[PDB]
Write a protein that binds this ligand. Structure first.
Ligand SMILES: CC(=O)N[C@@H]1[C@@H](O)[C@H](O[C@@H]2O[C@H](CO)[C@H](O)[C@H](O[C@]3(C(=O)O)C[C@H](O)[C@@H](NC(C)=O)[C@H]([C@H](O)[C@H](O)CO)O3)[C@H]2O)[C@@H](CO)O[C@H]1O
Ligand SMILES: CC(=O)N[C@H]1[C@H]([C@H](O)[C@H](O)CO)O[C@@](O[C@@H]2[C@@H](O)[C@H](O)O[C@H](CO)[C@@H]2O)(C(=O)O)C[C@@H]1O
Ligand SMILES: *[C@@H]1O[C@H](CO)[C@@H](O)[C@H](O)[C@H]1NC(C)=O
Lengths: 324, 165, 324, 165, 324, 165
């Protein structure tokens, strides 16, 4: 026979298959995966920034400073929050935090955080500091919320106290105050002397006047009255004044915050860890260069897009057709 | 489709090393398999550019669309979830379809590449070879190991052999 | 001449035409439609589940139990609601349902529904049941909302009544209560005896105190006072207590609900029917395997995506080029 | 485009039954039209897989993005509608473009199929026929009704006829 | 040699390049741009409709009729609003506009607008019109909001005044009213005589009762009391009644509106101009037939879609391969 | 890819006026460059239809998804922005990818067009010319300026010259 030259192409040992628009299960010499399916299964630091575990406290109890919670005095920043859905501790004294949904959203993640003293606890005037057996501290002593001070009558008299805060920080400042609603006009008399007390809170943009709503609530922890805690974000250069003659939980500590609402409040019962990823899910951390993922719709950070799909194989080689 | 792969060249070559396309020769003095670095590398660059584009162009924000809500704001909470879901449904369908469309085009590209390689050899030889219609060419003259190489590297001159045919 | 063999392709009798990216109105041998354009033009059952027509009542009047409406006592589930925009019946007595937007949304569709008696209507204590000519029943007798009881003075005295409800159902429970604001301090004295009455409603998470807001409203149906109806979803294991000494519309019937907010409140004046589809629109039912539709943007269920487009023909055959 | 349909084969065949592509023969003993079940069925499977993918891959939730609102919450109601509309605009454009792109590819696929069929016959015959450049082949020898069938089914051996040419 | 004919294709002098899916920087004979990058850099009329500059006033001060603002008496329509973020004028008297977010949204753009007198300013009864040095007019004379009338005691008596408005316009009507909260029970006595005054506002769907919240606010300009301004959209065929015996800022002018919420409130410090475009951005006007744009994500009207991308060149010609 | 442009025809022709594809001739009496209005115009109509579809099909509402909010409604304000951003990310990726995919197809279309033109001329001449494998055809007979024109306009009859070859 003669000299001969042939053109041909690659064949291999593969069960590798891809789907095309026109055909299912086409054998190919090589392919890659587009969807990320592997995660750490743990809570990780997010792009260098550690989260904050709330331990046995709910977010509410954490933010007001429930003495049973670990203090947030030393925190500087968090990428996200870890909260136990069945956390035992919250507002230790029977009460409610007003507009807590918005607050949760705004504290989901904050790049610059630091607690600060708005107004000195003794700078208020002639009043005492009230504690309660509902808010016991680490020891067992009666106490109260770190961020609020329960002012009561001193020497059978409750004077009209009035202080104001000036936002000089150059950043947004979260202020917290509260209103205590006693079980009866009798208790408000015992605690605040004045009948029908009031609290007036104002800025140069809004102004609220609070009166007491006496009655017996089916509370918890032994008390039967009710507390309503409010909050407001004071902007740089703004000022908020508090005036009261009873039933007032005064602001002591506030929070200086910058770049916030950048997080998430995960409630997943998975473990925290030393790892670091660019994408955290409620199921684990994800570190990948792939741009898709089918692990969990609840994800935060520089994440691949979550999609509802099985693995997607992109063909790189050619059709794998066996040797003649 | 270009009728080459799984077409008139009805089978692949196991033991084709470091390449997707190539040649198989047989003269008096042996055999005879080598990859075509030119067309293979060019195809590898294309697949790489394709993959890189598909991935590098996704440079937006793709984490969840969701906020924090208490149990009294269910409606706004349900809309937020429905919107997140809708956005996810758009990306889901596009991802599945893009991959199907792209796999379609990738296989056909390879088919086109080996077909253009076959045509390239056929143009070189002209009347100095018989086209067997299966990827092979039967030379009408004798071909050195140096002759084979000139065919492979595209320099083979049909005039320098015309007569032995 | 010699023997010959030819290669060729199909040609047919068609005016069938498709558009391609490069060409308009290209003749083809065959094609299919991607968009669904046909519907029943009626209200149908949705995936086996019948809707609920509200007849002559608005949703508000239906949910509180306006005696003129048909009762929702026997309902167990609905896929969506049908409401007449100009429905004559609603809150028969001059009043407003608080936060009715959210409620409408939550009752648009419910997979598990059953009315239940929260607290026995006579278990409250020494009070009478008040009716009115504004809320007459099917007969013509003076009545009141089925779900609420209008408590008034019994024997010239209105005692401090207090009952509480325990969510033991294991599912979410909708509770309704109300506050009546008389035309004057004179009428509240006639009706409730006590001056400046109050109602205190509390759970372990929140607590509201209601006082009366006397005055003459430009009402309807004979009356000129005002009622404010409130609601709340009690979660499994939660409890809500009501305490009042006047001006209080007490909760009688509540609703046990599971898998809700899954519906839609259609207000289209089209007819109901025995058909069953997987997709309902405000214009008719849709039953198709197609994944697109251009009939109506307002659609519910397992629907094709609505898109703003004329019919889209997908080519299946080849270019129809006439015979030589 | 592959230059076959509406190309060098300038017309279709009415009365081509149960097939898209096929053959038309004429020997001393009649004519002479049959579909090529092989290539036709293969093309039918591809179009079917295409259609099924386009439709079956849309398995998300596509009903309206809307909630219930009273007349005091117009803003949230307007945003909900604007978002629903935006999602609808994305699907609208994709649907129109996908169909245009796919129709483009479907017609070209058919073009490629009849061209690969024509090339397949041309490779069979080799020098035993003259290519008329219009889809027809003029045989240089005589062709039985059994000969025609071997050409149609791809088994025709050019060696078993070489001499009459 | 022989006669010869050759097939070939175009080559040109171009540095023009496009990217393809398989290759970067491919030379082509021609191409077009998909993204619009050029704008007017000014505020333009939008599709024939001129915007409305608010000058030195905030939207709040504009809508209530701050005497220092230019009147909106002659306006018929606007496509969008131009507001200075640091506008000096707003609510001249220390106060807040309730639910101003919604209002801003609804007045961002309106196709049919005209101010109207709801109730004649003197049709109220025996009361005087109060002015203030906080709301001085053009001249320097003490005045008040154009849209409200500050009713006070006339001849040492403040009678129970009560008027009602009937929406007969066939379109939606914005009504504004207000409540003045004096610095003390002493000032409310000086201004309105009656102790513990009230205002009752009602429609046939809702009813609000307002009481005074006395106290000293850290206000602005002379004053130290507080005003709360409310609003409501009255629908065609609806009516709203006002009843008061003090502390009431009565509705004088309202707005008849149709096709609203169609705009935007730009706060960009760019210049206004005589141009007209179909798309306005916070950065300038855009007039193009292109369907994409990378100039500004804040855009209004018949706009190209904003996308995050550098210029995108669509190839029209063929590959530009140099001559042999 | 069809192996024509930057393929076996290795270069463009500057000074090809009013056309994308064309012919270059040389007989005893001059040269010899003209555009092929037929195939050029057809390609221009396709590119135009393409461009028009890509743009005209975008007929929805594409301005911002945003409302007006005061400083107390930050959450709803942030969701509105996040949704606007998400919608923008979808269009961004689609725009970049569509252009890449379309440029890919546009260049290949041109490649296919000049290849189908070359094949068209090759079918005309049949045995009356030698295929030089670089876009050129060497005629075996003499070709008038009128002969060249019949080759260009597709009417050239190979029978009317068979013998001089
Ligand atoms: C000229 C003259 O004296 N006419 C009387 C006429 O007043 C009276 O009709 C009564 O009028 C009063 C107010 O003036 C109420 O309007 C009474 O109607 C209702 C009602 O039907 O709703 C009576 C109803 O029984 C009441 N329901 C309850 C629980 O008390 C309500 C209710 O008090 C108010 O709605 C609350 O503000 O009032 C109406 O009967 C007639 C008959 O008494 O005699 C004329 O001579
Ligand atoms: C309608 C009216 O009464 N206008 C008054 C205004 C109001 O009475 C006041 O704002 C109520 O809170 O008070 C004004 O002037 C006086 C001041 O110059 C003085 O310093 O203090 C007075 C009370 O102690 C009162 O504020 C004002 O704005 O002009 C007077 C104005 O006519
Ligand atoms: C009902 O609530 C009471 C509160 O006293 C609680 O003790 C009881 O456990 C609840 N019912 C059940 C079955 O848990």
């Amino acid at each position: 026979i003669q000299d001969r030259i042939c053109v041909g192409y690659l064949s291999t040992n593969s069960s590798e298959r891809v789907d095309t628009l026109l055909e299912n299960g086409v054998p190919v010499t090589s392919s890659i995966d587009l969807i990320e399916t592997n995660h750490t299964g743990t809570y990780c630091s997010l792009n260098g920034v550690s989260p904050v575990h709330l331990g046995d406290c709910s977010f509410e109890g954490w933010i007001v400073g429930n003495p049973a919670c670990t203090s947030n005095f030393g925190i500087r920043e968090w990428s996200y929050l870890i909260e136990d859905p069945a956390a035992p501790h919250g507002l230790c004294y029977p009460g409610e935090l007003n507009n807590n949904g918005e607050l949760r959203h705004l504290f989901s993640g904050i790049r610059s955080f630091s607690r600060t003293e708005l107004i000195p606890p003794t700078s208020w005037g002639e009043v005492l500091d009230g504690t309660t057996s509902a808010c016991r501290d680490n020891t067992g002593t009666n106490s109260f919320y770190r961020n609020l001070v329960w002012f009561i009558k001193k020497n059978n008299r409750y004077p009209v106290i009035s202080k104001t805060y000036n936002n000089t920080t150059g950043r947004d400042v979260l202020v917290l105050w509260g209103i205590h609603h006693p079980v009866s006009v009798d208790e408000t008399k015992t605690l605040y002397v004045n009948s029908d007390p009031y609290t007036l809170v104002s800025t140069k943009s809004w102004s609220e006047k609070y009166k007491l709503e006496t009655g017996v609530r089916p509370g918890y922890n032994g008390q039967r009255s009710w507390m309503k805690i409010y909050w407001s974000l004071i902007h740089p250069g703004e000022m908020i004044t508090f005036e009261s003659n009873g039933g007032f939980l005064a602001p002591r500590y506030g929070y200086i915050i910058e770049e916030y609402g950048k997080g998430r409040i995960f409630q997943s019962r998975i473990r925290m860890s030393r790892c670091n990823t660019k994408c955290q899910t409620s199921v684990g951390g994800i570190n990948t260069n792939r741009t898709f993922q089918n692990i969990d719709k609840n994800a935060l950070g520089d994440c691949p897009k979550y999609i509802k799909s099985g693995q997607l194989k992109l063909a790189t080689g050619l059709r794998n057709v066996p040797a003649i | 489709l270009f009728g080459a792969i799984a077409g008139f060249i009805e089978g692949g070559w196991p033991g084709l090393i470091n390449g997707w396309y190539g040649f198989q020769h047989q003269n008096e003095q042996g055999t005879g398999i080598a990859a075509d670095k030119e067309s293979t590398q060019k195809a590898i660059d294309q697949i790489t550019t394709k993959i890189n584009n598909i991935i590098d162009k996704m440079n937006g924000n793709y984490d969840s669309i969701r906020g924090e809500f208490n149990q009294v704001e269910k409606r706004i909470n349900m809309l937020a979830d429905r919107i997140d879901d809708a956005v996810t449904d758009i990306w889901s369908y596009n991802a599945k379809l893009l991959v199907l469309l792209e796999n379609d085009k990738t296989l056909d590209m390879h088919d086109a590449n080996v077909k253009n390689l076959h045509e390239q050899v056929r143009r070189e030889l002209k009347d100095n070879a018989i086209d067997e219609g299966n990827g092979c060419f039967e030379l009408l003259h004798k071909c050195n190991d140096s002759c084979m190489e000139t065919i492979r590297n595209g320099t083979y001159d049909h005039t320098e052999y015309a007569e032995e045919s």
